Design a protein that fits this description.
Chain E: It comes from Saccharomyces cerevisiae (strain ATCC 204508 / S288c) (Baker's yeast). Chain E: One of its GO terms (molecular function) is structural constituent of ribosome. Chain E: One of its GO terms (cellular component) is cytosol. Chain E: This is Large ribosomal subunit protein uL13A. Chain E: It is found in: Cytoplasm. This is part of a larger assembly, with chains A (151 residues), B (125 residues), C (106 residues), D (51 residues) and E (197 residues). Chain A is an alpha+beta fold and 151 residues long. Chain A has one domain. Chain A contains three helices and five strands. The longest helix of chain A has 18 residues. Chain B has 125 residues and is mostly loops. With 106 residues, chain C is mainly beta. Chain C has one helix and six strands. In chain C, strands 1-2-5-4-3-6 form a six-stranded antiparallel beta barrel. The radius of gyration of chain C is 14 Å and the shape is globular. In chain E, strands 1-2 form a two-stranded parallel ribbon. The chains are: A alpha+beta (151), B little secondary structure (125), C mainly beta (106), D mainly alpha (51), E mainly alpha (197). Chains A and C meet through strand 5 of A and loops of C. Chain B binds four RNA strands through strand 1 and helix 2.
RNA sequence: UGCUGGCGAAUUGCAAUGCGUGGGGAUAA
RNA sequence: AAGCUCGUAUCAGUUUUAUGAAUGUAAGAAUGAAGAGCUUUUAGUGGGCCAUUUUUGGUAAGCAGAACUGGCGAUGCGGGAUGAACCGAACGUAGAGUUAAGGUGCCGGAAUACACGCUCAUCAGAUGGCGCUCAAGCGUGUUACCUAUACUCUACCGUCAGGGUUGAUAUGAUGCCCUGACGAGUAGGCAGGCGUGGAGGUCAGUGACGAAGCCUAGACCGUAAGGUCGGGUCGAACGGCCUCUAGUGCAGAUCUUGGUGGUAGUAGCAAGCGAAACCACAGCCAAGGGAACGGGCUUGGCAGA
RNA sequence: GGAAUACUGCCAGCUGGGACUGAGGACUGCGACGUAAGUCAAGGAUGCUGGCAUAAUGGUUAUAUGCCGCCCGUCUUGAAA
RNA sequence: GAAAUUGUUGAAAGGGAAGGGCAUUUGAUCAGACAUGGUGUUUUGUGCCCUCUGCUCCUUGUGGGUAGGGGAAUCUCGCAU
């Protein structure tokens, strides 16, 4: 900062692009079963919990069911199914954007997993076959036309 | 240097008509002068001709892929003209400079922060 | 167990063309079970992949992929225009092309 | 012009004294060697005569 | 939608069928037309018999042995009608035709395997009721093909060997229709119906 | 997986599909 | 091209009213254009054919002649299967979008669309081929779609036009800019550049630690002329810059000289020895490609070293 | 007698999905919103995130595939010849 | 020691034409940093630093070069760890 510009570079114009919070599509409401589409956990049924500051979604399997940890995911790489669960019993507010820094798995992450997942397992047991539904993997069979399919 | 995305318009070399068929006709560009020539009347399928439209953007002209303008250098004196334009220009050590003198040039250009386009020229380890 | 398929499979038909001129940039894609432009509107903007075996192993895999996007519809049949990064080889006229479900509108 | 440009000359020429940085942490086991084309054949055509 | 799509000429129209079979190739869609002989055209017989012979008088001058080879066998008669819409020269073609297989009748190893029909090429779905229309069979016969008989007979045999089959099968699905009919009503069922099944 | 269980999945970090040669020997042509 | 007055009310392949025997003169009529006239001088240019609209001469017909306006000429591009005369469209380099003319069975990108009727033909019909018959034909209507260098928008190149810019501009005011419009081209004209041999000047230039040259499935720059660099080969001079000068830039001339092929191990000598003529390039048929032009194209038949 | 509803047309009505582009470079101007303080979609893209050095990537040559491409020059004639 | 042209070897292609343009795949192949910090604090240790004593070239204050000692308990002023 104290070091003078040794070469003449042009300063930027005062750019007129104020950032605005992400407006998610209508189908997403906290406590919604999703289908992840890309990455390590592609074609998995995963519960949606919180919209984060970095325009992502905080999601959990839960881990006890399908082996999906407390992960972040992008909004566009998800199909949101209409089947909603109870979410109000879960304390999500502990973790945010800063939680997912990396500067073998830490014990703190495992403890946050189990505390949340037990507070979620209790509500999954209410509806029939929902536990089995989350353990299963999504796929398009012969005759499945996604422009027709209601999720 | 933060440079614009360098657009080239035409990467391919503008070769001459029938430069490939005959051997005596060079690949160096010459216009077709005859009135009955298809290249001159710009028929479909035939080779593309050099015209002013293919001209490079003024802001990004003469720039190498590194985003520097090329500049020939003979000796340490001519090198030290670019003490103020390290981000803009790049030292091109001339072809005929000996291996004895290049080690001297590369020592100075490394110190001044001048990017040399052709190091390792005549210089083993 | 059998199906791991998260893509709609469709054939790569041709390039965008007239009778005598073809633009190799824009490829025409038939998609399975798609009959109208109205059904094809769903697939607009979705990422495409052409997956194929190659001879030499590149990154611990003998299989390479060309990625691209659906741009728009093409005629009344549900045939769809598609621009890839590197254009499809033209040897692939009538080859399977994987159309994915990201990015999702739904 | 001369106000900020001599300020600018001074700036660059002071950060030319990054020479000392290169020359304190030198200790480099390389050094540029010329390849004179006479030697390039004294050490080619004599190896082929060696074999 | 199916690696191979065995078709059954029986009651089709050279041209239309063909055409549609054409497209299907140029778009990587293996095919296998069968019962070729029992194909169909349009217009009286005496017609196709001419609109052919003409194709027969063809032949090259100096050397008739190097000109338009007039294939009699139906399969072929039709294979031409097809190779006629398929650049059949540029590799893109060769690549096709290379995807075809027109048989006269229905020889293994297809006999044992499902087939289909191109609803957009049926005498009974394109030709105005009662209206002249060839039947390749005769047409071929009338102009060479020396086997209409063999296939013929050697055919009826196939229909048997099968017909017999079906029975066994039909007699099988007669049970199921019951198995479920009974096992129907119960619960687990009811439910399904609700969702639709 | 017809029904009921008990464990493991992470850190892949917010997408980048994840069967011939060149010589021997033996014997058929 | 330049100089002179002006920048206007100077006009216009146009319409209108006015006034006479399609057609004359005016407008305090419209519409468009800041591009006008007066000198003075300087290149190139003396080809027709087709089509349109008026007639004039004409008998089996065709047409023959005259005048008038276009098309090609100097001109690509989309379409008409293919084309001097048809249809659309006058071209800087691209990206995206929309269309024209023509089309959507397949070859062929695009509806084996929808709706009303008609048509059976012993070579229907619309045919370029295959093929087509409640059509893929005929007559008509309704939408949907396909795509050109066309139009729209954006960037970029250059040209032209208008303009800003100094008690000096964080770049050579023959600089740095801001705005808009434009881009075909033969003969010819004007202008800015690139290269070669030598001269003056300069770079206290490069150079046996390798100059010049030569290659190179090597790299970069310049629209291009070309310039620069790496690698290999080489062995002694050479280059940039500001200027000067000319025996200065090649594909052709039945070019000159030198060298080397195919022909050909052929003709030949009245297993060996060994040319020449000649040589744009190749050499399958059918059909169309208007023009006593089919050999390259279009559509078919076909085609194994 | 009682409402509609197509059809034509309007909205300086609302809410989405996709592609392409990001030119320019301190601030001046026309504005909107906010009582003000300010802020903003207002005289041209910013912010976050990932992939790297045995990288990432980019190129040359060789052929294949789809489409397109009459043999150059001179000299005639109306152009093809 | 160029090109035409010739042989060998290696690679590629070849069903009655090749060479060219737009685009891309495959095969072969070449590129791809003696890049290494930047900033803000903290030990010390030195010097052109503080301080004591000077000497010398010249032009206007807003000068330049260059010795002998001391001193870090003040000082980041610089450079080394």
């Amino acid at each position: 900062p104290k070091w003078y510009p040794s070469e003449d570079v042009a300063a930027l114009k005062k750019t007129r692009k104020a950032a605005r919070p992400q407006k998610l599509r209508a189908s997403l409401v906290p406590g919604t079963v999703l289908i992840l589409l890309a990455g390590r956990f592609r074609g998995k049924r995963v519960v949606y919990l919180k919209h984060l500051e970095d325009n992502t979604l905080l999601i959990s399997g839960p881990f006890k069911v399908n082996g999906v940890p407390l992960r972040r995911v992008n909004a566009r790489y998800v199909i949101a199914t209409s089947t909603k669960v109870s979410v109000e019993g879960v304390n999500v507010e502990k973790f945010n954007v800063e939680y997912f820094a990396k500067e073998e798995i830490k014990a703190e992450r495992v403890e946050d997993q189990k505390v949340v997942d037990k507070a979620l397992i209790a509500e999954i047991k209410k509806t029939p076959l929902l536990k089995q539904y989350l353990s299963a993997s999504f796929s398009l069979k012969n005759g499945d036309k996604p422009h027709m399919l209601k999720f | 240097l933060p440079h614009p995305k360098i657009v080239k318009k035409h990467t391919k070399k503008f070769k001459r008509h029938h430069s490939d068929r005959y051997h005596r006709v060079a690949e160096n560009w010459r216009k077709q002068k005859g009135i009955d020539s298809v290249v001159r009347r710009r028929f479909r399928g035939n080779i593309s001709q050099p015209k002013i439209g293919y001209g490079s953007n003024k802001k990004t002209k003469f720039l190498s892929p590194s985003g520097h303008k090329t500049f020939l250098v003979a000796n340490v004196k001519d090198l030290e003209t670019l003490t103020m334009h390290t981000k803009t220009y790049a030292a091109e050590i001339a072809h005929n400079i000996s291996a004895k003198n290049r080690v001297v040039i590369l020592a100075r250009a490394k110190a001044l922060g001048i990017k040399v386009t052709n190091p390792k020229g005549r210089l083993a380890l | 167990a059998e199906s791991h398929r998260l893509y709609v499979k469709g054939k790569h038909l041709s390039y965008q063309r007239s009778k005598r001129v073809n633009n190799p940039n824009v490829s025409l894609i038939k998609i399975e079970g798609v009959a109208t432009p109205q059904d094809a509107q769903f697939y607009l903007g979705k990422r495409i992949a052409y997956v194929y075996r190659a001879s030499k192993e590149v990154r611990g895999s003998k299989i390479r992929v060309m990625w691209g996007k659906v741009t728009r519809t093409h005629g009344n049949s549900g045939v769809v225009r598609a621009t890839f990064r590197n254009n499809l080889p033209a040897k692939t006229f009538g080859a399977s092309v994987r159309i994915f479900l990201y990015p999702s509108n739904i | 012009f001369f106000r900020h440009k001599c300020k600018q000359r001074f700036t660059k020429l002071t950060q030319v004294m990054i020479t000392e940085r290169r020359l304190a942490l030198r200790e480099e086991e390389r050094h540029y060697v010329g390849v004179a084309p006479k030697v390039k054949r004294r050490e080619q055509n004599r190896e082929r005569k060696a074999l | 939608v199916e690696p191979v799509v065995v078709i059954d000429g029986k009651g089709h129209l050279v041209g239309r069928l063909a055409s549609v079979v054409a497209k299907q190739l140029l778009n990587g869609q293996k095919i296998v037309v069968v019962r070729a002989e029992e194909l169909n055209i349009s217009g009286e017989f005496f017609r196709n018999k001419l609109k052919y012979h003409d194709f027969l008088r063809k032949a090259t001058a100096f050397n008739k042995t190097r000109g338009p080879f007039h294939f009699r066998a139906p399969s072929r008669i039709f294979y031409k009608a097809l190779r006629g819409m398929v650049s059949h020269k540029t590799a893109r073609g060769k690549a096709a035709l290379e995807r075809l297989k027109v048989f006269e009748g229905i020889p293994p190893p297809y006999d044992k395997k499902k087939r289909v029909v191109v609803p957009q090429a049926l005498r009974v779905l394109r030709l105005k009721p009662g209206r002249k229309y060839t039947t390749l069979g005769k047409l071929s016969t009338s102009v060479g093909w020396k086997y209409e008989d063999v296939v013929a007979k050697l055919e009826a045999k196939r229909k048997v060997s099968s017909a017999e089959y079906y029975a066994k099968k039909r007699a099988f699905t007669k049970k199921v229709a019951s198995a479920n009919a009974t096992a129907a009503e119960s619960d687990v069922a009811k439910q399904l119906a609700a969702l639709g099944y």
